Coordinates of C-alpha atoms in Angstrom, one line a residue:
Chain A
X1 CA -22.4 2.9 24.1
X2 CA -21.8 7.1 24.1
X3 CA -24.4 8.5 25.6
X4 CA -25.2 12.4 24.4
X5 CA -27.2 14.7 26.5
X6 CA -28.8 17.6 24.6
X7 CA -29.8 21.3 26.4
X8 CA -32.1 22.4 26.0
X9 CA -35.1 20.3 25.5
X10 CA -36.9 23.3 24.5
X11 CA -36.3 27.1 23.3
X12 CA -38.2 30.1 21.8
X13 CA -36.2 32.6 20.8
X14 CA -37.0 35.9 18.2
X15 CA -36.5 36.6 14.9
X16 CA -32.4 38.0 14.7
X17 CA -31.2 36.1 18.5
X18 CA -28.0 33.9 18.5
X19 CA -29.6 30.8 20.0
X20 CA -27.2 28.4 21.0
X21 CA -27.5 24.5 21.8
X22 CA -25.1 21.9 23.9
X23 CA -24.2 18.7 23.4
X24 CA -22.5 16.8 26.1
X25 CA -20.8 13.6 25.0
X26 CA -20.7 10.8 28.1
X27 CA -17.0 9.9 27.4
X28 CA -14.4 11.3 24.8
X29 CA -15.7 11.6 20.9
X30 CA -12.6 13.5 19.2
X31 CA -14.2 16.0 16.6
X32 CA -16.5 13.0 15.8
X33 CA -20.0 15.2 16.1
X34 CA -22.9 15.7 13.2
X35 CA -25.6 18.2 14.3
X36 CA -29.2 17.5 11.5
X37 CA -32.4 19.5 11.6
X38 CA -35.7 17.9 11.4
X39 CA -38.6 19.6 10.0
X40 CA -42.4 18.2 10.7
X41 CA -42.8 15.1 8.7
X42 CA -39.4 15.9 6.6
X43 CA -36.3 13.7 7.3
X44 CA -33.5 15.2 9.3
X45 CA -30.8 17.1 6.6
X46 CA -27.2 17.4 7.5
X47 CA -25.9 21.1 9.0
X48 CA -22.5 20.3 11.3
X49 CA -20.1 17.3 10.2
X50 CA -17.1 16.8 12.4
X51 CA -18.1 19.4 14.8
X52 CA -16.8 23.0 12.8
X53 CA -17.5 22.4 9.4
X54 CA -20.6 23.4 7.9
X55 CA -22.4 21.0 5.5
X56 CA -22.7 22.1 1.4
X57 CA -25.8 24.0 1.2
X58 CA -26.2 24.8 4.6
X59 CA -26.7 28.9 5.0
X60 CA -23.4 30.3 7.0
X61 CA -25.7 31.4 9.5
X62 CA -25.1 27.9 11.1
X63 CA -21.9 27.2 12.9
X64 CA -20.9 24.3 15.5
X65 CA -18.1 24.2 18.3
X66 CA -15.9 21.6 20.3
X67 CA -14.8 22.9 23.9
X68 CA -13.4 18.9 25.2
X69 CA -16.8 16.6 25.3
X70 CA -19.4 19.8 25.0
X71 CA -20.6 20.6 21.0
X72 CA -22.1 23.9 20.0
X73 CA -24.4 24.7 17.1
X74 CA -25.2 28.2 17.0
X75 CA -28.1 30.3 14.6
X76 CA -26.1 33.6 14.6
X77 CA -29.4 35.1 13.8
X78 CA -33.0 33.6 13.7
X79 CA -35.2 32.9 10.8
X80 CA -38.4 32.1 10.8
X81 CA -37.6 28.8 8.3
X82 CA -35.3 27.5 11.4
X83 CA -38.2 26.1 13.0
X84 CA -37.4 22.1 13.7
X85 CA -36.2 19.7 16.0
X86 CA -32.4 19.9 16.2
X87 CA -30.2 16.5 17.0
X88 CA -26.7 16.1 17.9
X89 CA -24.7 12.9 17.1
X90 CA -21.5 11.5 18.0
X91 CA -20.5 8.7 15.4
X92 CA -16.7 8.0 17.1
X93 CA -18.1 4.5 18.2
X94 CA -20.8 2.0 17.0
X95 CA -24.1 2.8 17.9
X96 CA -23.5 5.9 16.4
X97 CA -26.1 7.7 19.1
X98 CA -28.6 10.9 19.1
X99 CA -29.0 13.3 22.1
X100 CA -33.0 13.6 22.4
X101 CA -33.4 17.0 20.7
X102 CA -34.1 20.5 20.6
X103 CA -37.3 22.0 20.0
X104 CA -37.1 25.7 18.6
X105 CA -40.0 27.4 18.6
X106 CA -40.0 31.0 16.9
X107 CA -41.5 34.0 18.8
X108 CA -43.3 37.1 17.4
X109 CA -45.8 39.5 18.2
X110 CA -49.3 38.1 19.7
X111 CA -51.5 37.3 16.5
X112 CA -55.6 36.8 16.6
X113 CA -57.1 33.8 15.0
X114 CA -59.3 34.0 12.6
X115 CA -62.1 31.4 13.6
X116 CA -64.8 29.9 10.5
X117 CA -67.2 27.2 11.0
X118 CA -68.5 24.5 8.6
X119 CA -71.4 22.4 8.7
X120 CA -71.3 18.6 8.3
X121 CA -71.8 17.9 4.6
X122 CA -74.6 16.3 3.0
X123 CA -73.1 13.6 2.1
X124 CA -72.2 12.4 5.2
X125 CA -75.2 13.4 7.0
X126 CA -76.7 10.7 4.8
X127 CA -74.5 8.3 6.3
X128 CA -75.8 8.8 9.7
X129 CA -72.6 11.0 11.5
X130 CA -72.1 14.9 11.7
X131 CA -69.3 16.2 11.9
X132 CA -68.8 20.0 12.9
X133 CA -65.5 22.0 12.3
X134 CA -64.5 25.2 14.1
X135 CA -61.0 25.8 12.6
X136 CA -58.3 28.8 14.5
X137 CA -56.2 30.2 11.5
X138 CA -52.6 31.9 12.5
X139 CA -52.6 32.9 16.0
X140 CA -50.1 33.1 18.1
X141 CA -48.9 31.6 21.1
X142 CA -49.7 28.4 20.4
X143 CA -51.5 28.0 23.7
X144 CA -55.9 28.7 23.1
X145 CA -59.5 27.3 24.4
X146 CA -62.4 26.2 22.1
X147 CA -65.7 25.5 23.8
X148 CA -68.6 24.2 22.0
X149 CA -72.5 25.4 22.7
X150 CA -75.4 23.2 21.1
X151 CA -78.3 25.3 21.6
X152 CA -76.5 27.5 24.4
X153 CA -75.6 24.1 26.1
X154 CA -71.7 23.7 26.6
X155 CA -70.5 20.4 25.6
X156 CA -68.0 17.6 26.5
X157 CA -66.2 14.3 25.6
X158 CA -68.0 14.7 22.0
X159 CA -65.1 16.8 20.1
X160 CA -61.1 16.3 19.0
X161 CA -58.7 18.9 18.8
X162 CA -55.3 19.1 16.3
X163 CA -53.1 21.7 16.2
X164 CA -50.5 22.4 13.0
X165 CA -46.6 22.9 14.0
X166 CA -45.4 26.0 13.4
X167 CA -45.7 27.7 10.0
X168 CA -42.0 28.4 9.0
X169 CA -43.3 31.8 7.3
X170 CA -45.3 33.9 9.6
X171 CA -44.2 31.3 12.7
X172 CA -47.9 31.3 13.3
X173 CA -50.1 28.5 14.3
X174 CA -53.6 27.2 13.4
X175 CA -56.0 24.7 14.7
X176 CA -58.6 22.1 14.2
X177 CA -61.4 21.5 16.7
X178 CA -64.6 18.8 15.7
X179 CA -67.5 17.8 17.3
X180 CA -69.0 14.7 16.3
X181 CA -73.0 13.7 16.4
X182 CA -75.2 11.0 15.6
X183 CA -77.3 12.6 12.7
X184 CA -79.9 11.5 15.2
X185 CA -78.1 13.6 17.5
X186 CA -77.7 16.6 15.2
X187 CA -80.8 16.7 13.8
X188 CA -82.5 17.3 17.6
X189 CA -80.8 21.0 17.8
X190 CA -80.1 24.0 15.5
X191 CA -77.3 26.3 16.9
X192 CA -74.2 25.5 16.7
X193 CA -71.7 27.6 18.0
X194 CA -67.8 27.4 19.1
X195 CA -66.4 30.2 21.4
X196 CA -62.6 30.7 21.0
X197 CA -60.6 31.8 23.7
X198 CA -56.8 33.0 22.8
X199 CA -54.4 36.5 24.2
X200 CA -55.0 38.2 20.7
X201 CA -58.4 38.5 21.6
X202 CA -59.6 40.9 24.3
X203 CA -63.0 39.2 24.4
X204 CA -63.7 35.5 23.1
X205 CA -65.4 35.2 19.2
X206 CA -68.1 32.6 18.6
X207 CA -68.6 31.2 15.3
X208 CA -72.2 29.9 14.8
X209 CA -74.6 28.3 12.3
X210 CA -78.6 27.7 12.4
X211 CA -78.7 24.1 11.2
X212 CA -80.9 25.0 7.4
Chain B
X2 CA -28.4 11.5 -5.1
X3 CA -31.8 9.6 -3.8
X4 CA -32.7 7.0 -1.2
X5 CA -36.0 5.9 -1.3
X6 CA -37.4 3.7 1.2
X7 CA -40.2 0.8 0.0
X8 CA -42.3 -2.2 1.7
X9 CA -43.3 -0.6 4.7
X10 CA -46.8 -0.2 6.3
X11 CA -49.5 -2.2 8.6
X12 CA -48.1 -5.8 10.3
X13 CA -49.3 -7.7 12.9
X14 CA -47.6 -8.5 16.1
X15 CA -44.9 -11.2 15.4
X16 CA -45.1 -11.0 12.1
X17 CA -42.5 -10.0 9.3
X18 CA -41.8 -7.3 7.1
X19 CA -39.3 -6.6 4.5
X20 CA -38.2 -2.7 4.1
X21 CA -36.2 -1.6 0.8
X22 CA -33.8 1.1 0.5
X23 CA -33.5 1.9 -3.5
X24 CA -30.2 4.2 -4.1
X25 CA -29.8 6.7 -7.5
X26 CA -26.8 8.8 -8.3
X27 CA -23.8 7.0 -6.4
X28 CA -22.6 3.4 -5.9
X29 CA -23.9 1.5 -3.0
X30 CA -20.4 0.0 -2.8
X31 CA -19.1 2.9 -1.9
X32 CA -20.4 3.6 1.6
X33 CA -22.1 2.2 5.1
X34 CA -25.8 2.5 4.6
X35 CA -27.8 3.0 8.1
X36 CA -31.3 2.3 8.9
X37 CA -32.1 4.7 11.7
X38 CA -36.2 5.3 13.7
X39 CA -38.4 7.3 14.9
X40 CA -41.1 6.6 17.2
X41 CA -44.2 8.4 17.2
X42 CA -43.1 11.9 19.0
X43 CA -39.8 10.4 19.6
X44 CA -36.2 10.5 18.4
X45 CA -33.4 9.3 16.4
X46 CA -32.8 5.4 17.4
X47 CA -30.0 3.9 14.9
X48 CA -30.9 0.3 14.3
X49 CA -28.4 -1.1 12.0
X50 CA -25.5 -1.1 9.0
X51 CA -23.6 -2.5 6.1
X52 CA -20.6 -2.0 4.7
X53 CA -22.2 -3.6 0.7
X54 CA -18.6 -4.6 -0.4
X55 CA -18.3 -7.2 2.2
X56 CA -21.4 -6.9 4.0
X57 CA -20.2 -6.7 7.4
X58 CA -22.9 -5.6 9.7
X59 CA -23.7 -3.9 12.6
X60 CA -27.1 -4.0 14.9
X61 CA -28.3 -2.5 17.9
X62 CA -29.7 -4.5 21.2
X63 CA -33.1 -3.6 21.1
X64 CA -33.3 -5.0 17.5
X65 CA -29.4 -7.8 17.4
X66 CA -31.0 -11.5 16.2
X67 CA -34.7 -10.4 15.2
X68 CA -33.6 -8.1 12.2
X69 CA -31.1 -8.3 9.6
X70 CA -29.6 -5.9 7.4
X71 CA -28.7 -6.8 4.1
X72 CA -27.6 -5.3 0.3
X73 CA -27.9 -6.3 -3.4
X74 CA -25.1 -4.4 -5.4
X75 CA -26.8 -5.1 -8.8
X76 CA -30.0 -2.9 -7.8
X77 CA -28.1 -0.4 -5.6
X78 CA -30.7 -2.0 -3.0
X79 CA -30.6 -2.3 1.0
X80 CA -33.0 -4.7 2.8
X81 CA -34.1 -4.8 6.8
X82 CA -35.4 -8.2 7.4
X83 CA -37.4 -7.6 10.6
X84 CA -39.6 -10.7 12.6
X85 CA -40.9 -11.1 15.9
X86 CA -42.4 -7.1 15.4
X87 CA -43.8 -5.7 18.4
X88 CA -45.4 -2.4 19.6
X89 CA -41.6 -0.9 20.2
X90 CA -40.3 -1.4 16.7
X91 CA -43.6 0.9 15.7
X92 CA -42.2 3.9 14.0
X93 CA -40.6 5.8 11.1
X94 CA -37.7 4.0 9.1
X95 CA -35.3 6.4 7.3
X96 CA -32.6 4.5 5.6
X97 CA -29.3 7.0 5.0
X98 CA -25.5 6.8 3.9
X99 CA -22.2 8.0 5.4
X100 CA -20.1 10.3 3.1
X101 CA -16.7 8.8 1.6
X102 CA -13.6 7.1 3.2
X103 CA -13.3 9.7 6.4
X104 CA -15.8 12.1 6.1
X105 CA -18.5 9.7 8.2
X106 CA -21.3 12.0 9.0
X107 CA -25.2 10.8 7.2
X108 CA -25.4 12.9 4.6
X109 CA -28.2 11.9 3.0
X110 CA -31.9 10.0 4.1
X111 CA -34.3 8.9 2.6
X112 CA -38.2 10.2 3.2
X113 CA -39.0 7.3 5.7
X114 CA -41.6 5.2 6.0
X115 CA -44.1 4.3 8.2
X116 CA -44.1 0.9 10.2
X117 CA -47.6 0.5 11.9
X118 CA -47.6 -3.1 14.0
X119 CA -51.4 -3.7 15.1
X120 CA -53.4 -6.5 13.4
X121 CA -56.1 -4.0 13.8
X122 CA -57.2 -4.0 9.6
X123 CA -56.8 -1.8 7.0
X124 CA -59.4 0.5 6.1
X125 CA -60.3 3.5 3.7
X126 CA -60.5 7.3 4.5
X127 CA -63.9 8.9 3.7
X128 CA -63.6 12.2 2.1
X129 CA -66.4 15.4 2.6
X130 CA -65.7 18.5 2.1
X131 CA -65.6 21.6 4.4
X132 CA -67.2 24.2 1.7
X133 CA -66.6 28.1 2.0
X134 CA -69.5 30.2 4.1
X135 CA -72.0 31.9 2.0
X136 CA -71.6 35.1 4.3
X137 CA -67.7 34.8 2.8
X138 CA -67.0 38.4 4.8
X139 CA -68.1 40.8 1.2
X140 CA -64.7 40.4 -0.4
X141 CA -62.0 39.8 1.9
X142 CA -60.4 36.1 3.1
X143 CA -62.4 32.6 2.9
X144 CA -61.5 29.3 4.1
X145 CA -62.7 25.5 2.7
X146 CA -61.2 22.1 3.1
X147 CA -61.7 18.5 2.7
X148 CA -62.3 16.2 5.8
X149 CA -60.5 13.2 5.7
X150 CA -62.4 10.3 8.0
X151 CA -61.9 7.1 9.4
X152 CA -58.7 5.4 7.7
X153 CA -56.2 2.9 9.5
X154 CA -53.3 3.5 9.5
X155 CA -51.0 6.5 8.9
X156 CA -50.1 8.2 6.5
X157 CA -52.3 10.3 4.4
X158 CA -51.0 12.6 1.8
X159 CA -53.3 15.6 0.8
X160 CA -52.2 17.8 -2.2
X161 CA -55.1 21.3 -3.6
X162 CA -56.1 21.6 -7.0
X163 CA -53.0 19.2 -7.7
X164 CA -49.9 20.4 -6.8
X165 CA -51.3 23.9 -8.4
X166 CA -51.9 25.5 -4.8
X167 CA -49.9 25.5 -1.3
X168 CA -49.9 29.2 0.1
X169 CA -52.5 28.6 2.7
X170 CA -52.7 25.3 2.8
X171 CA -52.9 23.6 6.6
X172 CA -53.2 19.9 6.6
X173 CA -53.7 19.5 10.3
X174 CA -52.0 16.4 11.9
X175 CA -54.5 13.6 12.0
X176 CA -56.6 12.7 15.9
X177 CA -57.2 9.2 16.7
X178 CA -61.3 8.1 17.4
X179 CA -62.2 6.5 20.5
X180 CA -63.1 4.2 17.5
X181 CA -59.5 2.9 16.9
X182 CA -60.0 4.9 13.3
X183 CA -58.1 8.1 12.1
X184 CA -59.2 11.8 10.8
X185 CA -57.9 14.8 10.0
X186 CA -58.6 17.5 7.8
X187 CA -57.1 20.1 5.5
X188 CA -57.9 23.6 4.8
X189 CA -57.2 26.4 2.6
X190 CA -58.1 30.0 2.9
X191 CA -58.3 32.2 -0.1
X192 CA -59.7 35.5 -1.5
X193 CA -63.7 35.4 -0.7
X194 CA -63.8 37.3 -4.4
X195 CA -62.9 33.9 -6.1
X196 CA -65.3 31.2 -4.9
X197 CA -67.6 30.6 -7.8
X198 CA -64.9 31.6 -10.8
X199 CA -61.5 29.2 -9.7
X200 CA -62.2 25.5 -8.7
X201 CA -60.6 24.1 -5.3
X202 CA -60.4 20.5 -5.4
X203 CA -58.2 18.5 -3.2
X204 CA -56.4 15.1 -3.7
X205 CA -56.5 12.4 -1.1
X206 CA -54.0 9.7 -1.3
X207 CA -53.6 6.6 1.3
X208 CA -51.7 3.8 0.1
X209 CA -52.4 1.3 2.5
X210 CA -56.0 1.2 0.8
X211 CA -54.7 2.0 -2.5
X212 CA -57.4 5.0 -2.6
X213 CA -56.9 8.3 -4.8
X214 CA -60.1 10.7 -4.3
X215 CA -59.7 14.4 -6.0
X216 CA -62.9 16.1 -4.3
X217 CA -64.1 19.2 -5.9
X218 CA -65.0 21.6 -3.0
X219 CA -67.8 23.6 -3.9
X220 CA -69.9 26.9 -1.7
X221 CA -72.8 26.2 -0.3

């Protein structure tokens, strides 16, 4: 069974870099080579098929490359839209294999989130659970700290955090923090606050709320 | 040309499932079909193929004996039998096609569905929704959403004022409660200057509980 070993694992380059990515096939694989992209949730599409020849559809910017067992699909230059999870395969023998993928991450200029806050509803305060959202929207890096204060008092264990993949516009991120609360629990306070903590801010923001 | 993947969702260790793979636009006959995975944050694992004419198959180790690829040339239809499920074979399953008679790269997949394999039960999101701030800046950018609580399993599909609006838009992946339950939410920002005038609703859809909620997110 081929084995195909992918570099990188991981990339970010800018908006108008060649990036380039290997594939190194175990034993020989002719011109037998497919390179798909993956976007989050989509299935992968086509690009490369038999190593040089670039799919129908498939803007020219793409182009792949056979030096012996190493493959080579290239993005001339960068667009924002090219963010995915890029696999090579080698179909020469059954299993047709998969190296384990490229991650390209975009990279532009640092970009502050914009933080909002929303109370738990009424309609599930009824059913005895409150759940509080601070939500991050379009920052970038990717990389931030939410902290949440009950009354002034910092808090742990009691909130969930989800972050989106990329947008393949702006190549920003955004993300969701919630702290969860016994309406019992909720009911026994009335600040609610979440400081935010990311490089496009030269001071943390808090987002806040008096519970009424 | 289509491929669209059926008869996948929740099923319980050792237990069978039945996946379809309905073709359009081209003759089944014509081409190996592929059933290839994906595992939660994982990649690519080919798991099997047919040639429909004669139906000579191929399978891969992990899954050779348990499942079984087959095809029905009348509906344009491909089948994965799979039995003895465990918490490996837990993943997406696309279902694709090689090109013609030497060009054998997989030109086209379907969306993929979701395998879950718990026997864990089923059980139906809550929807509340996450309404725009009164102090809504004087005129500038709001946001508003719909929480989306405690369903089992994946997927759920969240669409805004039906298909009508998608600039904005961030369904955030979905976070798993110490619970053994799912949640996630969805948000939209939009020009503070429209709250009361335009109407934001948002459709929830999860097919494993056959549930279709179209909350109306209003200030407050």
């Amino acid at each position: 069974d081929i084995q195909m070993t992918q570099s990188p694992s991981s990339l970010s380059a800018s908006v108008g870099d060649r990036v380039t990515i290997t594939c190194r096939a175990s034993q020989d694989v002719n011109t037998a080579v497919a390179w798909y992209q993956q976007k989050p949730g989509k299935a992968p599409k086509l690009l490369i098929y038999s190593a040089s020849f670039l799919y129908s559809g498939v803007p020219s910017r793409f182009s792949g490359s056979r030096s012996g067992t190493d493959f080579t699909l290239t993005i001339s230059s960068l667009q924002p839209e090219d963010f995915a999870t890029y696999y090579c395969q080698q179909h020469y023998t059954t299993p047709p294999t998969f190296g384990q993928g490229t991650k390209v991450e975009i990279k532009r200029t640092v970009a502050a989130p914009s933080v909002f806050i929303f109370p738990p509803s009424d309609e599930q305060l009824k059913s005895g659970t409150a759940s509080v959202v601070c939500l991050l929207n379009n920052f970038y890096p990717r990389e931030a700290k939410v902290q949440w204060k009950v009354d002034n008092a910092l808090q742990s264990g009691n909130s969930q955090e989800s972050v989106t993949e990329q947008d393949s516009k702006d190549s920003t991120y955004s993300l969701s923090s919630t702290l969860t609360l016994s309406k019992a629990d909720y009911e026994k306070h009335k600040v609610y606050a979440c400081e935010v903590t990311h490089q496009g801010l030269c001071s943390p923001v808090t987002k806040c709320f008096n519970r009424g | 040309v289509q491929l669209v993947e059926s008869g996948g969702g929740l099923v319980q260790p050792g237990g069978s499932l039945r996946l379809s793979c309905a073709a359009s636009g081209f003759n089944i006959k014509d081409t190996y079909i592929h059933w290839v995975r994906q595992a939660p944050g994982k990649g690519l694992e080919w798991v099997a193929r047919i040639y429909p004419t004669n139906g000579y198959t191929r399978y891969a180790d992990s899954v050779k004996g348990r499942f079984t690829i087959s095809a029905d040339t009348s509906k344009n239809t491909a089948y994965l039998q799979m039995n003895s499920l465990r918490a490996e074979d837990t993943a997406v399953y696309y279902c694709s096609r090689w090109g013609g008679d030497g060009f054998y790269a997989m030109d086209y997949w379907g969306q993929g569905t979701l395998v879950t394999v718990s026997s864990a039960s089923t059980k139906g999101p809550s929807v509340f929704p996450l309404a725009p701030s009164s102090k809504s800046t004087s005129g500038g950018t709001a946001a508003l959403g719909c929480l989306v609580k405690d369903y089992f399993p994946e997927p759920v599909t969240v669409s805004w004022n039906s298909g009508a609006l998608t600039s904005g838009v961030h369904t955030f992946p979905a976070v798993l409660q110490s619970s053994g339950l799912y949640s996630l939410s969805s948000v939209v920002t939009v020009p503070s200057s429209s709250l009361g005038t335009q109407t934001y609703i948002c459709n929830v859809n999860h097919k494993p509980s056959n549930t279709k909620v179209d909350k109306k997110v209003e200030p407050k």
